[PDB]
Amino acid sequence: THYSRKPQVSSKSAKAKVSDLRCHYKNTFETANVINGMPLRKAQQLYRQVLAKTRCIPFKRYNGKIGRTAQAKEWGQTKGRWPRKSVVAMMSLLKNAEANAIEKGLDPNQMVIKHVQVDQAARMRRRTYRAHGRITPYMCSPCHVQLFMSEKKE
Amino acid sequence: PKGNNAIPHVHQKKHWNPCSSQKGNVKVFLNQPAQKHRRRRLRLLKAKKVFPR
Amino acid sequence: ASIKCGSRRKARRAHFQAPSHVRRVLMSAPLSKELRAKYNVRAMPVRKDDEVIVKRGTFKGREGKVTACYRLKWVILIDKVNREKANGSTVAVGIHPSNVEITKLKLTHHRKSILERKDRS
Amino acid sequence: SGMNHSAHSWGTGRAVARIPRISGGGTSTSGAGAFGNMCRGGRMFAPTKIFRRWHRKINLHQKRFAVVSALAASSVPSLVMSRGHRIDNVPEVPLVVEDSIQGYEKTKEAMAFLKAIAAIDDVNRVNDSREIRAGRGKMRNRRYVARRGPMLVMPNNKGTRAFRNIFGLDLANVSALNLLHLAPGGHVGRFVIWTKSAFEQLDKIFGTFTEASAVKKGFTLPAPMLTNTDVTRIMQSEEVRRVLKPKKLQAKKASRYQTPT
RNA sequence: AACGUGUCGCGAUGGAUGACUUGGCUUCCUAUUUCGUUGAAGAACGCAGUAAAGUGCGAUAAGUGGUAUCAAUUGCAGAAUCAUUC
RNA sequence: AGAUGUGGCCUGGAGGUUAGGACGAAGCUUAUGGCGUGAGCCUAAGAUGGACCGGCCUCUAGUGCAGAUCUUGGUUGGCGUAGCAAAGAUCUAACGGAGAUAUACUCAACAUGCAACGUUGGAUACUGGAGCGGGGAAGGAUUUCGUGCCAACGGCACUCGU
RNA sequence: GAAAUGGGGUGCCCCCACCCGUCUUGAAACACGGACCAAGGAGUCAAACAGACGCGCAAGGGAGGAGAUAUGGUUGCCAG
RNA sequence: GUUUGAAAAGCACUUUGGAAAGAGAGUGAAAUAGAACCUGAAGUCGUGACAAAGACAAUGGAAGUACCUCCAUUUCAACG
RNA sequence: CGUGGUUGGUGCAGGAGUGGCGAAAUUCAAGCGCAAAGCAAACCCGUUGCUGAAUACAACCCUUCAUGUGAGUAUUGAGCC
Numbered sequence A: 001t002h003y004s005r006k007p008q009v010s011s012k013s014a015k016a017k018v019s020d021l022r023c024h025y026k027n028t029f030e031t032a033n034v035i036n037g038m039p040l041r042k043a044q045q046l047y048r049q050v051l052a053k054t055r056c057i058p059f060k061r062y063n064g065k066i067g068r069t070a071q072a073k074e075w076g077q078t079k080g081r082w083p084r085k086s087v088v089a090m091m092s093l094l095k096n097a098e099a100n101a102i103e104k105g106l107d108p109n110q111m112v113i114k115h116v117q118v119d120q121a122a123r124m125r126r127r128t129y130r131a132h133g134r135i136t137p138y139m140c141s142p143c144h145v146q147l148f149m150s151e152k153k154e
Numbered sequence B: 001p002k003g004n005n006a007i008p009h010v011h012q013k014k015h016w017n018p019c020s021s022q023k024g025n026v027k028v029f030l031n032q033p034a035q036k037h038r039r040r041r042l043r044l045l046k047a048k049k050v051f052p053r
Numbered sequence C: 001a002s003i004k005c006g007s008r009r010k011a012r013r014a015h016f017q018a019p020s021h022v023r024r025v026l027m028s029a030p031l032s033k034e035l036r037a038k039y040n041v042r043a044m045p046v047r048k049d050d051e052v053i054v055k056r057g058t059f060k061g062r063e064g065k066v067t068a069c070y071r072l073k074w075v076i077l078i079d080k081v082n083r084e085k086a087n088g089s090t091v092a093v094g095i096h097p098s099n100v101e102i103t104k105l106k107l108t109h110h111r112k113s114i115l116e117r118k119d120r121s
Numbered sequence D: 001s002g003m004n005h006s007a008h009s010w011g012t013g014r015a016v017a018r019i020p021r022i023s024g025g026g027t028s029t030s031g032a033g034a035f036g037n038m039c040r041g042g043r044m045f046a047p048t049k050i051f052r053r054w055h056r057k058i059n060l061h062q063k064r065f066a067v068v069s070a071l072a073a074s075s076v077p078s079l080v081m082s083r084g085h086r087i088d089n090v091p092e093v094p095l096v097v098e099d100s101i102q103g104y105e106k107t108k109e110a111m112a113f114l115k116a117i118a119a120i121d122d123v124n125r126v127n128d129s130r131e132i133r134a135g136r137g138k139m140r141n142r143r144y145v146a147r148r149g150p151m152l153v154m155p156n157n158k159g160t161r162a163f164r165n166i167f168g169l170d171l172a173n174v175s176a177l178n179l180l181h182l183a184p185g186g187h188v189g190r191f192v193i194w195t196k197s198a199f200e201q202l203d204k205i206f207g208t209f210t211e212a213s214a215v216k217k218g219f220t221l222p223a224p225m226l227t228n229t230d231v232t233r234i235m236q237s238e239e240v241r242r243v244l245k246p247k248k249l250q251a252k253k254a255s256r257y258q259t260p261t
Numbered sequence E: 001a002a003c004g005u006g007u008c009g010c011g012a013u014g015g016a017u018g019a020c021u022u023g024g025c026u027u028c029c030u031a032u033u034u035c036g037u038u039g040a041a042g043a044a045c046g047c048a049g050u051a052a053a054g055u056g057c058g059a060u061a062a063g064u065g066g067u068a069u070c071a072a073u074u075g076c077a078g079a080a081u082c083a084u085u086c
Numbered sequence F: 001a002g003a004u005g006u007g008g009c010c011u012g013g014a015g016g017u018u019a020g021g022a023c024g025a026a027g028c029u030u031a032u033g034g035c036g037u038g039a040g041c042c043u044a045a046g047a048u049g050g051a052c053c054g055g056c057c058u059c060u061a062g063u064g065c066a067g068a069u070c071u072u073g074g075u076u077g078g079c080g081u082a083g084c085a086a087a088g089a090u091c092u093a094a095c096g097g098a099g100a101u102a103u104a105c106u107c108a109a110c111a112u113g114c115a116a117c118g119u120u121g122g123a124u125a126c127u128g129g130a131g132c133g134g135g136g137a138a139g140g141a142u143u144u145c146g147u148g149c150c151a152a153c154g155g156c157a158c159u160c161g162u
Numbered sequence G: 001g002a003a004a005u006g007g008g009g010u011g012c013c014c015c016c017a018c019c020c021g022u023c024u025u026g027a028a029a030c031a032c033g034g035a036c037c038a039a040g041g042a043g044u045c046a047a048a049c050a051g052a053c054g055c056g057c058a059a060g061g062g063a064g065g066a067g068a069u070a071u072g073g074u075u076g077c078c079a080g
Numbered sequence H: 001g002u003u004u005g006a007a008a009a010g011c012a013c014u015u016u017g018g019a020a021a022g023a024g025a026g027u028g029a030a031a032u033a034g035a036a037c038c039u040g041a042a043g044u045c046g047u048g049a050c051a052a053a054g055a056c057a058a059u060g061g062a063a064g065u066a067c068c069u070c071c072a073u074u075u076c077a078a079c080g
Numbered sequence I: 001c002g003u004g005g006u007u008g009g010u011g012c013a014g015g016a017g018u019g020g021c022g023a024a025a026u027u028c029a030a031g032c033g034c035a036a037a038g039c040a041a042a043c044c045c046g047u048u049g050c051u052g053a054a055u056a057c058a059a060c061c062c063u064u065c066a067u068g069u070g071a072g073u074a075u076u077g078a079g080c081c
C-alpha cells in the first residue's frame, strides 16, 4: 500500500522498500534523493565513494548550518556531508532491488533508478534530563524509503 | 436595574440541593403513581385476607 | 431461555453471556420435513454425531455429520463442510445452526425424553 | 461526577492558566486541569437534576375540549385523509360497524373483517412502513417505527382478543378515550372504526350542546363561535354583495412606450 | 541555477469522525431481604497437565457432595464409557 | 453598547406524516458546479466507504467557537541546530562475528566498503592501601550464576550487559 | 465534434488596502492575549412575584393530596 | 473499545537478506481489511507532474487579461 | 357445656411461594454486472395488459488479450400463522 508511483512497464522494473529503517530521516533524505536519475551502477559507485570520502552527499533541503565543503561543487551546492549510516543502509536496498531484478529475468547493468521517495516514519520515544529537574524529549525520527528502477536499454 | 418588583423572600439559603459537597434536603414525588398503585394492590390483597368482613 | 425482553442491552447481554446449558437451546436447528412430520417436533438442539444439511452460506446443499458443537464460538462442525489452509491441511469450517437443518437424530434415552416433551400432538 | 478529585489551582507565577489541577504525581492525569465545564474529566455546565419539571398539568375542561375537537375531526373525511390514512375504499366516515366483532376469537377472522369493512388499506400502510428507526434511539429500546393506522373503539374492555395481534390496528375503549391516540403527533383526524354500541353511548359520555353529560359532571359541549363556519358564502351572498362598494372603472394601464417625464 | 513558493495526482505521519455498544447514569418495583467469638469484614500466602495477571476455590484447593439438565470442555494435551442413575 | 423581529439557517433526541439504501446509507474528499444578500442548502465525481438514513409539521435540549497565560491528544518551525568538553589513554597482531578485502566493461594495487564490536597475547598507562582493592549495616530483593540471544533499553557504539 | 456563454484554478498588470481580539477619551501600537490542528468549551435548572402575549372557564376559577375502576388487566404499551 | 473478516481461510512455497524485512505467489468479495488490522479527518510531510516568480514579508479588495479546467448551461441549418 | 393448631407432643390435606418443563406457521419460486427490474398518474381496472437509453463500467484516446460482483433478513411472485 506504499508506492507513490508505479512503473511504466512493470515487467521491466524491480521494486525495493524499507519498513522502518532507523537511520535519520534528514540524512537518508539526501543520501537517497541524489540517485533519483542515476543508473544502478553509477548510483552504487557514488555510495562507495562517499564512504571513501572522495565524493559527498549534497544536503539541499535539510542542510541548515552544516559545514560547507569543497566537494559539493559537483552538485552545484556549497555544503554537503558523508552520512555513512544512511549511505550503507541505501546500499542494502540497492542490493535488494537488483536481486529482485535477477529473479524477474532482467540485466541489473541497465537499470536506471526511477522513483526514490523518502518519508518520515513514526518516531521513537526516549528522554533526556535537563537542568533544574526538567525532563524533555529525545526522539529518534526514522524513515521509510522506497524505490523501483526501470530498465532502459538499446 | 431593579424596578417595581416585589420584595422577594424566597427562603432558599440552607443547602437544600444535592451538589458535589451537599447531600441535600429535598423530597421528590416521582414514585407518586407507583405508591398509588401499591396501596390499592395492597388493599385488594388485604380485602381478600380478611374476607368477608 | 427467555433472552428477548424489553431491554436490548439486557437481552443482548443474556445472549452473549449465556452458560453452555443456555447455549445448547440457543444453538438449535430445524428438522427435515420427513422428520419434523414424524416426531411432530419443529426444531431440535444440535448434538454431535447427528446428520445435517446446510441451507445458508457458500456451503449450502452440503450434507454431513456433526463432529463438534463448538458452543464457545457459537458454531457447528460438519466433517464434509471444510476447506484447506495454505499448508494443504484441511480445517473444519463453522456454521451457525440457524443455517442448517437436521436430517437424522442421534437418539439416547435422554434425547428420546426431550422429543416426548416437545411433542406437539 | 467530574468533582471527585482533590484538585487545587496552582495559583499564579507559573506559565499555566488559573484552573484547578489534579494533585499528586507519577500518573498522566497529575497536573491536568479539573473542575470546569471545559476540562476533560470535569463536570458539565449546570448538571441536570431530577427535580426538573417533567410532568405538566392541564385544566380539566381544556383537556375535554381537546378530546372533543380531535373527535369532531375524525368525522371530517378531508382531515382524516390529509393526515395519512388510506380511507379511499371505506363505506362511510364516521364508519360504524356492528358488535358481532366483539366475539371473534381468531385473528384470521378479525383480518377478514378489515378486508370487508375496507380498513385493510390502512393496516397495509403500517406494515410497509415498519423500518428500523434512524439515530441513537434504536440503542435505547426504540428499534422499530411504524405509522398509526386505524383505531378500533369498543364499547367496553371485552372482545379484544382477535384484534390484539394485528400489527397496525389500535384498540380503544369509549369510556376512556385518549388524546394521545385520537390526535397522535398533535395532528387531528385519526381514522376510527367505532362499533355500534360505542357510538350509541357517545352522547352520554360527552353530552350535547344543550344537555350535559352523565359521565363528565357538568360538561356540555362548548358553544360554536360561528353558527355557519363558511365565511366565504357570506362574502358571496346576495345580501352582502348588495351593500358593497361598486367596482369603479379603473385607470388604463401602461404601454411598452414609456411615459413623458 | 540552487533554495524557496503555489496548484493538482499518489504516498506517509496522525488517530478525528461516522456507524457500532455484554458499560455507565437516572427512575420505579418485589421479598419467610441485613454480618460476626459457631471467628466477620479486611489482609496474607497458596491451588491447573500447561497458568504471569484476573476469576474461582482452600493442602478435599480453577474444586468434593447432592439435585436438575442431557453430551460437552476446547488454546493444546489427557480421559472408563460414548451414555435409565452409578 | 443595547432592544426586537424573522413560513431565518444549523445540531442531538421525541410525536406524527412522506420517502430513500448492498444497482451502495452514515462518514470522509473537492479547480463538483448550481443558488441563497447571508447563516446555509443541493447536485455531481471518489479509481472512498460498507449499513443505515432523508424531507416537512410539531415537541424537546448537555444545540453553533477563533482567541478564556482555555482543557486533553497530536503535530510543527527552531533543527540535523545547542550540544554529548571534570574523573589523563590508548596502541598492536591473531581469532571470533552477517558486520568484508563488498567495483557494469577493455582496471595491477592507492585514487570506488568506510566506520564500529568481543576475546586472548603483547606493548603502554592509570588507581596508588583515606584504592575504579576485599568484606558488612541501612537500603535494594534476583541485580548472583551458566547458556542462548540484540527488537526496545545501556543519551556514541556493541558481537558486550546489572 | 465542436462552438459559445459562465463558474472554478494559477499567474500578471494598473489601482486600493496598517494586525486581529480586548479594556479605553483614543490601539496598526513600543498596551494585554495570540506557533498549527482535531475534540471538548460558558445565561442552565428550580422556587417566588411581575408585565407582555397565546388558551380555557368567568362572579366565579383551579387544584393539590388522595381515592376509584377500565386495570382485581398487562413482559410491555400503562409512571399515561 | 481488542471494532481484521462471514469464517483464520492469520500469507504455504520461491529467492534476496545475518536478521527485521523486501520482491513474487496464495487465501478472501475486499490484503489501499495482513494482526490494537472497520471508517481513516484536519494539521504536517515526501514524491511525480506542472504554474510561475526579482528584491514591495505575506494575506486581502476591485477590475480586466493570459493560460488551464474528470464543471455547468446553451447551440448546431431554410435554426440558436 | 363449649373452645384454644399461639400448651406441648404426635400425625396429614389443599394452596401459595420456589425450581425445572411447556405452543403456531416459507429456508416457498425465480441467479446472479446488466429485469432477483419497472410502468399502467386517489381508488378501481389489475388473478390484467407492454416494458430494457447498463449493445455497462474498468481513468489521455482507439484497438488486441485478460480479469471483476461474498452471504439474500433485499426485490418480485405465490402461500401461510
Ligand SMILES: NC[C@@H]1O[C@H](O[C@H]2[C@@H](O)[C@H](O[C@@H]3[C@@H](O)[C@H](N)C[C@H](N)[C@H]3O[C@H]3O[C@H](CO)[C@@H](O)[C@H](O)[C@H]3N)O[C@@H]2CO)[C@H](N)[C@@H](O)[C@@H]1O
Pocket (backbone or CB within 6 Å): E011, E012, F029, F030, F046, H032
Ligand atoms: N493535496 C491537497 C490536499 O488534499 C487533502 O485531501 C486529500 C486527501 O485527504 C485525500 O485522500 C486521497 C483520495 O483523494 C484518493 N481518492 C484516495 C486515497 N485513498 C486518499 O489518500 C489517503 O489514503 C492514502 C493511502 O490510502 C494515504 O497515504 C493518504 O495520506 C490519504 N490522504 O485526497 C484529497 C485531495 O483530493 C486535503 N483535504 C487538503 O488539505 C489539500 O487540498
Ligand SMILES: [Mg+2]
Pocket (backbone or CB within 6 Å): B020, B021, D003, D004, D005
Ligand atoms: Mg468533593
Ligand SMILES: [Mg+2]
Pocket (backbone or CB within 6 Å): D001, D002, D041, D042, D043
Ligand atoms: Mg465526566
Ligand SMILES: [Mg+2]
Pocket (backbone or CB within 6 Å): none
Ligand atoms: Mg402480546
Ligand SMILES: [Mg+2]
Pocket (backbone or CB within 6 Å): F062
Ligand atoms: Mg454546551
Ligand SMILES: [Mg+2]
Pocket (backbone or CB within 6 Å): F085
Ligand atoms: Mg566533544
Ligand SMILES: [Mg+2]
Pocket (backbone or CB within 6 Å): F128
Ligand atoms: Mg601512579
Ligand SMILES: [Mg+2]
Pocket (backbone or CB within 6 Å): none
Ligand atoms: Mg545508545
Ligand SMILES: [Mg+2]
Pocket (backbone or CB within 6 Å): none
Ligand atoms: Mg467606550
